Each structure stands twice: as structure tokens, then as C-alpha cells.
Design a protein around this ligand. Structure first.
Ligand SMILES: O=C(CCCCCCC(=O)Nc1ccccc1)NO
Ligand SMILES: [Zn+2]
Length: 257
């Protein structure tokens, strides 16, 4: 099956998922000098006060923190979006070394990790319907750079020992995702895709300009997770990122100048 190894990684995915060579694939390199400032873009509205986290899961390719999305509890509105998008989960992509790990790049610069806060358009009723629509998902992407520790991330870091292998989950209640946001909500936006199979072209990407800083010790703990299940030979969960894809006939817009 697909993964991030030499024999099943991103350069192989097109054989099972031909959309991998499609017209709206993610991630992309953000060329800051060719992005277009769009004064019609609205500020983002992030309403995470009533977020209800439920569980953290190692799914074999990343770890997901899952939220209750049965009501409009934690929503994203505004920006380039029409309507209301509910938060369903967040996860990260990261590297084996501090100089790689992000999926998006900025003027070819790679960050140590990238956080994806995943939201779905409530007009489609459920997440599975939303992924079939061109405006179904909105993903907030936040870059991580290695520096000072991020206090709001430590609760995530400390539970990773309990979900070391694929298929393990743990209860993870009362986590506030507001502690993961940067000070500024300036962003770039473009239409794209999931970055993992099935690579569906259903995502409005909103990539924040300002990275958050995490400490070396925090990111080191991400690198101790395993791709494998318990009892199988150990494969460290590192470099779970897809390289940049061609922009094709797309324009990246900026909310700032
Ligand atoms: O692709 C991304 C960003 C958005 C991920 C959305 C969650 C992944 C997911 O649920 N994938 C999926 C969708 C439909 C059918 C099967 C899997 N990062 O890797
Ligand atoms: Zn992702």
C-alpha cells in the first residue's frame, strides 16, 4: 500500500491514484514575488472557543487529533471561503532533519514541519460528501520552525508515547487548538488537493505567513513515532511529506502586501 518509503512513496502514488498528475495538486512552492495581493480577501474568522477534542490516533502515516464535528463548535469562516467550515482534525507532517519536513515551501525554503487544521464545508452534510466537491474542505497550514518551545504543543508531545505504533489511540479531551496559532493571521490561498492518497482536488488551502516556533526537543518526539504496527519491525515515522507539485493554471493570492 502507499506510504513514504523508497518503494511506495510519492513518486509511485500515480499508479494507484492517477489524479496525482492532476491540474490542482498540492503542495506547491509559494513564490512570494509572484503571489497577487487581493484586497477583496477578507480576514480569517477562527472561532475555536467551543472546540471539543476527543482522541489522538496514530493512523500509520501521521497522528491525528480528532474533534467533535457534530455541531458548529469550532468553525472557520471568512477569508476566501463562502459559508461555514467545521474543524474535524489536525495533524502534522515533519522531517528526519530540521531543514525539511514541510509540504509547502516559501521561495523554496522548507520548514521543519507543517500543521494542517482540516475543516469541511457544512453545506455538504458530512465529511465524506465534502471531499467529493471542489469547495469541500478548507485546510489551514501553519509552518513550524525550530527555536523556542511552544507551550501549547506540549500536551500533544507528552501523549505520543501512548500512540507509538499504527492503530493505537488515546483519549485526548479538553485540548485547545488556539494555542497552536501564530500572532498574525496573514495568509496565502490557492485551490489544491489532499496531499495524501486519494489526493482529491477538494481543498481551499489557507497557508499562514507567520510560522510558529517549537523546540528541538518537541520535534524530536515526533520522530520517535512508528509507521509500523506493534510487533512489526520498527520504521520511524519521519519524512511523511509530499514534495511540491506544479502550479499549472493557478494563481496564489495573498491577503497582505
Ligand atoms: O491531505 C492533507 C490535508 C487534508 C487531509 C484531510 C484528511 C485526510 C482524509 O480524511 N483523507 C481521505 C479522504 C477521503 C477518503 C479517504 C481518505 N494532508 O496530508
Ligand atoms: Zn496534511
Amino acid at each position: 500500500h502507499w506510504g513514504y518509503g523508497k518503494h511506495n512513496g510519492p513518486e509511485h502514488w500515480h499508479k494507484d491514484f492517477p489524479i496525482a498528475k492532476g491540474e490542482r495538486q498540492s503542495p506547491v512552492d509559494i513564490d512570494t514575488h509572484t503571489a497577487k495581493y487581493d484586497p477583496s480577501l477578507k480576514p480569517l474568522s477562527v472561532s475555536y472557543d467551543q472546540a471539543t477534542s476527543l482522541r489522538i490516533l496514530n493512523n500509520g502515516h501521521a497522528f491525528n487529533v480528532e474533534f467533535d464535528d457534530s455541531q458548529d463548535k469550532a468553525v472557520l469562516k471568512g477569508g476566501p471561503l463562502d459559508g461555514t467550515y467545521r474543524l474535524i482534525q489536525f495533524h502534522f507532517h515533519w522531517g528526519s532533519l530540521d531543514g525539511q519536513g514541510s509540504e509547502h515551501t516559501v521561495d523554496k525554503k522548507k520548514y521543519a514541519a507543517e500543521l494542517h487544521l482540516v475543516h469541511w464545508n457544512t453545506k455538504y452534510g458530512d465529511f465524506g460528501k465534502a471531499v467529493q466537491q471542489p469547495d469541500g474542505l478548507a485546510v489551514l497550514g501553519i509552518f513550524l520552525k525550530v527555536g523556542s518551545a511552544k507551550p501549547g504543543l506540549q500536551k500533544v508531545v507528552d501523549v505520543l508515547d501512548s500512540i507509538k505504533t499504527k492503530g493505537k489511540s488515546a483519549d485526548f479531551t479538553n485540548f485547545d487548538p488556539r494555542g497552536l496559532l501564530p500572532e498574525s493571521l496573514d495568509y496565502w490561498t490557492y485551490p489544491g488537493s489532499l496531499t495524501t492518497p486519494p489526493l482529491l482536488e477538494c481543498v481551499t488551502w489557507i497557508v499562514l505567513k507567520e510560522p510558529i516556533s517549537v523546540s528541538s526537543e518537541q520535534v524530536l518526539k515526533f520522530r520517535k513515532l512508528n509507521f509500523n504496527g506493534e510487533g512489526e519491525p520498527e520504521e520511524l515515522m519521519v519524512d511523511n511529506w509530499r514534495p511540491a507539485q506544479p502550479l499549472k493554471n493557478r494563481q496564489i493570492k495573498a491577503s497582505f502586501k
